[PDB]
Amino acid sequence: HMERYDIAIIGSGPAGLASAINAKTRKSVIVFGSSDLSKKLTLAPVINNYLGFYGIRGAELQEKFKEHIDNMGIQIENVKVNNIYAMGEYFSIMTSKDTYEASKVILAMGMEHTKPLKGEDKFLGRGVGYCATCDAPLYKGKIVTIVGYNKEAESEANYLAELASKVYYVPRYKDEYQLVSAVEIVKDVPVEIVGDKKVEKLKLKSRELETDGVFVLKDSAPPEQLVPGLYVEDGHIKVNRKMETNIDGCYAAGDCTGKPYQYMKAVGEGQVAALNAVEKLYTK
Amino acid sequence: HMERYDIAIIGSGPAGLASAINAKTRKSVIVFGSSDLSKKLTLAPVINNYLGFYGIRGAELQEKFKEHIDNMGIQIENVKVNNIYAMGEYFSIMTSKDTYEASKVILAMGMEHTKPLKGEDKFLGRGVGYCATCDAPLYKGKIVTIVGYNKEAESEANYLAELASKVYYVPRYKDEYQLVSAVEIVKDVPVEIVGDKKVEKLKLKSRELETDGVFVLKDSAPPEQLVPGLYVEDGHIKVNRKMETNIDGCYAAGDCTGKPYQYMKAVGEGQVAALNAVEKLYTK
Ligand SMILES: Cc1cc2nc3c(=O)[nH]c(=O)nc-3n(C[C@H](O)[C@H](O)[C@H](O)COP(=O)(O)OP(=O)(O)OC[C@H]3O[C@@H](n4cnc5c(N)ncnc54)[C@H](O)[C@@H]3O)c2cc1C
Ligand SMILES: Cc1cc2nc3c(=O)[nH]c(=O)nc-3n(C[C@H](O)[C@H](O)[C@H](O)COP(=O)(O)OP(=O)(O)OC[C@H]3O[C@@H](n4cnc5c(N)ncnc54)[C@H](O)[C@@H]3O)c2cc1C
């Protein structure tokens, strides 16, 4: 069904966990993200600029962070947040599973490193989107191509196969893929989304797919799509010294706020966002 | 004599150490402060909001920070910084011992918690000051009272006893005091600095001292006195998202920049300041 919380934290990396441990000062808090917290932490080899942990390996620091949240009774809700609608005094939070409401939101999604595909921006809203399940009814009986950058994208492909006339899945990571037989896996490199007034084809290095929709599925939609009305410049969510965005009650912390992309900056921002959000909840 | 460095960090607490470990990316760096890093860290009992160190004691976290800087060959220069003069393209740094020049400065002095004495602001520049050794020639053959909040203040009293006709030392901490016999220790509580056009007396709870100067000696002068021309509001050094102050080449990080006074905020700010300072050194 629906569940209400005082604070929702969108991301489970350094920034979101820093927010969570500072918000547990009560005030219900929910943290959305991945079971493994942050993929970048796991991939980091030796870390020498996180003060107090000289020479730690990324996966070791990840475990220290996991034990911290576990000691404080903080769990990660393992769902993808698709859209956050600023209703004015609260936020409606749409996810890959259930819908939530929260009084305050802390954006902590990190920063996407991969570039958009050619034609992606051009056809946005004319056949390109960032949430396949959200737009699924629009593609009933149509051809849909999903360019998947994470495992959740596979679930969206499976769902779309129940409505679309044909589903192609283009993986952008190496794994076994848990897809129903109706999904055609296209192990090729996307080149360009093309069309006249709307999407007509996805061109790949060795193949072209006639398709009505192309969904580009990453850990998070671009922030201005995830949070309609949010002020972003240069792909960075713009915040002030209190980590406040342009949307009252919506904060942002970590790589999603701009450079430098470092752990200490991220945890500091998460702390500031959470303490300010809590203050606003007690002052109304 | 004088020594030149690319970056000078003013403070050895969480913020300054975070700056130091991020600036050692070369670029000579000098860190001014106390041997014990930060007094607040030592006094902190259990810390649960420093991500990755759940349940750590303050002195334990202090030791982790000490081992980090030691592993990176970062030493603390154990002197008090008295004044930083923005010369335009560099900074002249006056200390309780030698003078330094630095291309970039990172202010990391923390935030003073004790309030000013009554009359302190009123007589500033008319008998009240924050550096006794700096103003010592002005008090040759005059009466000087030092209200000392740290051990360095004792050294300043000893120096002033060579020039002033009479030196009183009013300690604001419990310890043995290493003072020459010419210094009179006044174990009483300051109440008010009084005078007409200039300082004439220090009133204490049980005694009044006729005095020509009153020096209030804390770990650092107020930031607008430490750094002439620095923009401060509400006792907080005002910085932007890059930790830049109003003075080009001068950054600030940690409690000295405003609330919340927390460790994660401080280390994040120190990191941002240092990485920006380094960038400016490589771009000129
Ligand atoms: C190989 C490598 C080495 C690095 N080494 C260092 C180093 O030595 N020192 C250093 O300071 N920095 C280092 N970094 C950078 C550092 O990892 C980042 O600055 C830091 O991880 C930022 O954390 P964050 O919480 O802002 O974002 P992230 O760490 O990206 O966390 C984001 C998390 O939120 C989840 N999420 C995002 N959007 C949504 C959504 N819509 N719904 C649900 N969940 C979502 C993601 O799945 C992810 O788990 C390194 C990065 C890499 C890639
Ligand atoms: C009892 C107590 C418990 C606390 N518990 C927590 C907690 O659980 N979690 C949390 O997040 N925060 C806590 N805090 C607050 C936290 O300690 C501060 O936010 C943090 O120490 C800020 O560090 P900083 O580097 O900005 O300043 P500081 O820690 O004050 O470091 C300043 C250092 O620079 C030196 N210095 C200053 N001026 C000069 C100068 N002119 N020349 C030379 N050296 C100078 C000082 O001697 C000092 O050593 C606590 C504070 C106290 C007092």
What gap in Å lies between CA A175 and CA B41, rounded to an integer?
Answer: 46
What's the rounded Cα separation, in Å, for the pair A168 and B91? 62
d(CA B195, CA B160): 22
Q: Residue B267: its chain A contacts at CB < 8 A? A: 51, 264, 267-268
Chain A residues with CB under 8 Å of B258 CB are: 241
C-beta separation of B97 from B113 below 8 A: no
d(CA A69, CA A57): 19
In one letter, which amino acid is B67?
Answer: E
Contact B54 A48 (CB under 8 A): no
Q: Tell me the structure's resolution in angstroms, rounded to a single decimal.
A: 1.9
Cα distance between residue B104 and residue B102, in whole Å: 6
The 3-state DSSP class for residue A268 equals helix
B38-52 burial code (b ≥16 CB/10 A, e <16): bebbeebeebebbbb
How many CB atoms lie under 10 A from the CB of residue B205?
A: 8
CA of B97, nearest ligand number: 2
The residues spanned by each domain of chain A are 1-112+220-284, 113-219
Q: CB neighbours of B162 closer than 8 A, spacing ≥ 6? A: none
d(CA A105, CA A47): 30
Rounded Cα distance, B172 and B186, in Å: 10
Q: Which residue from B48, B51, B271 is facing A260, i.e. has the nearest CB?
A: B271
- Rounded Cα distance between B174 and A248, Å, is 48
The Cα–Cα gap between B29 and B5 comes to: 6
User: What residue type is assigned to position B128 of the chain?
Assistant: V
CA B91 vs CA A199, A201, B22: distances in Å: 59, 60, 21
Residue A9 CA to ligand 1 center (angstroms) comes to 14
Compute the distance between CA of residue A254 and CA of residue A15 in angstroms, rounded to an integer: 5
The set of protein residues with a Cβ atom below 6 angstroms from ligand 2 is B 10-16, 32-34, 37-41, 43-44, 47, 49, 80-81, 108-110, 219-220, 226, 254-255, 261-263, 266
What CATH architecture is B113-219?
3-Layer(bba) Sandwich (3.50)
Ligand 1, residues A17, A219, A243: which to mutate, most atoms within 8 A of Cβ?
A: A219
Say yes or no: CB of residue A13 within 6 Å of ligand 1.
yes
Tokens of A207: 């193949």
Q: Which atom of ligand 1 is nearest to the CA of A37?
A: 49
Q: Kindly state the DSSP code that residue A247 receives in the 8-state scheme.
A: S
Gap between the Cα atoms of B236 and B233, Å rounded? 5
Euclidean distance between CA atoms B180 and B227, whole angstroms = 31
Q: How many CB atoms lie within 10 A of CB B67?
A: 13
Q: Of B125, B118, B117, give the one whose Cα is nearest residue B198.
A: B125
Q: Could you check whether B1-112+220-284 and B113-219 share the same CATH topology? A: yes
Cross-strand pairs, B189: none
User: Which pair of tokens denotes residue A29?
Assistant: 């808090």
Span from the CA of B39 to the centroid of ligand 2 (angstroms):
7
User: How far A22 CA lies from chain B's nearest CA (Å)?
Assistant: 6
**Is B65 close to A52, i.e. CB distance below 8 A?**
yes
Nearest partner of B103 among B5, B240, B27, judged by Cα? B5
Question: Residue B91: what residue type?
Answer: F
Distance (Å, whole) CA B179 – CA B159: 10
The Cα B111–Cα B118 span in angstroms is 19
Collapsing DSSP states into helix, strand and coil, what is residue A276?
helix
Degrees, nearest 5: CA angle B45-B49-B53: 75
Q: List binding-site positions of B for FAD.
A: 12, 15, 34, 38, 49, 81, 219-220, 255, 262-263
Distance of CA A37 from the midpoint of ligand 1 (Å): 9
Q: And the tokens for A115?
A: 């570039």
Contacts of A262 in chain B (CB under 8 A): 22, 271, 275
Query: How far does CA B168 lie from the centroid of its chain?
Result: 22
Q: Note whether B68 contacts A61, CB cutoff 8 Å.
A: no
Cβ B189 vs Cβ B209: under 8 Å: no
| Residue A38 in contact with ligand 1 by CB distance below 6 A | yes
For β-strands A213-217 and A128-129, DSSP reports them as parallel
Residues B38 and B109: their CA atoms lie apart, in Å, by 10
Q: How many of the other CB atoms lie within 10 Å of CB of B98?
A: 12
What phi and psi values does residue B38 have, to the nearest 5 degrees?
-140, 130
What are the contacts of B172-181 at 24+ separation with CB within 8 A? Answer: B172/B114, B172/B147, B172/B148, B173/B148, B173/B149, B175/B151, B178/B151, B178/B154, B179/B154
Residues whose CB is less than 8 angstroms from the CB of residue A74 and which lie 6 or more positions away in sequence, other chains included = A17, A20, A21, A24, A29, A31
Separation between Cα atoms, residue B164 and residue B224, nearest integer Å? 27
CA A258/CA A15 separation, integer angstroms: 13
Determine whether A283 is exposed, middle or buried from the number of CB atoms within 10 Å of its CB (0-12, 13-18, 19+).
Answer: exposed
Q: Which ligand is nearest to the CA of A9?
A: 1
Angle at CA A251, nearest 5°, toward A60 and A5? 85
Contact assessment for residue A94 and residue A228, using Cβ atoms and an 8 Å cutoff = no
CA B143-B145-B149 angle, 5° bins: 160
Q: Which of A82, A81, A102 is nearest to A90 (CA)?
A: A102
CA distance B104 to A193: 48
Nearest ligand 1 atom to the CA of A255 is 26
Which of A19, A264, A275, A278 should be substituted to probe chain B, the one whose Cβ sees the most B Cβ atoms within 10 Å? Answer: A264
Dihedrals φ, ψ of A85, to 5°?
-110, 115
Residues B27, B4 contacting (CB under 8 angstroms): no
Cβ neighbourhood burial of A137 (10 Å; 0-12, 13-18, 19+):
exposed
Which value, in Å, is the radius of gyration of the alpha carbons in chain B? 19
**B119: how many CB neighbours lie within 10 A of its CB?**
21
Q: Cβ of A54 and B68 within 8 Å?
A: yes
Which residues of chain B does A55 touch, with a Cβ-Cβ cutoff of 8 Å? 71
**Maximum Cα–Cα distance across chain B:** 60
Residues facing residue A259 across a β-bridge = none
Judge contact between B57 and B47, C-beta under 8 A: yes
Fold for A1-112+220-284, please state it. Answer: FAD/NAD(P)-binding domain (3.50.50)
Distances in whole angstroms, Cα of residue A210 to Cα of each of A156, A214, B279: 19, 10, 47
Q: Which residues pair with A185 in a beta bridge?
A: A169
Of residues B49, B68, B265, nearest to A51 (C-beta): B68
Indicate the SS3 state at residue A274: helix
Determine the Cα–Cα distance for residues A184 and A149; give it in Å rounded to an integer. 16
What is d(CA A254, CA A238) in angstroms, rounded to the nearest whole number? Answer: 11
How many Å lie between the centroid of ligand 1 and the Cα of residue B272?
17
- Mapped to the 3 state alphabet, what secondary structure does chain B carry? CEEEEEEEEECCCHHHHHHHHHHCCCCCEEEECECCECHHHHHCCCECCCCCCCCECHHHHHHHHHHHHHHCCCCEECCCEEEEEECCCCEEEEECCCEEEEEEEEECCCCCCCCCCECCCCCECCCEECCHHHHHHHHCCCEEEEEECCCHHHHHHHHHCCCCCEEEEEECCCCCCCCCCCEEECCCCEEEEEECCCEEEEEECCCEEECCEEEEECCCCCHHHHCCCCCEECCEECCCCCCECCCCCEEECCHHHCCCCCHHHHHHHHHHHHHHHHHHHHHC
Pocket test for ligand 2, best of B35, B225, B263 (most atoms within 8 A of CB): B263
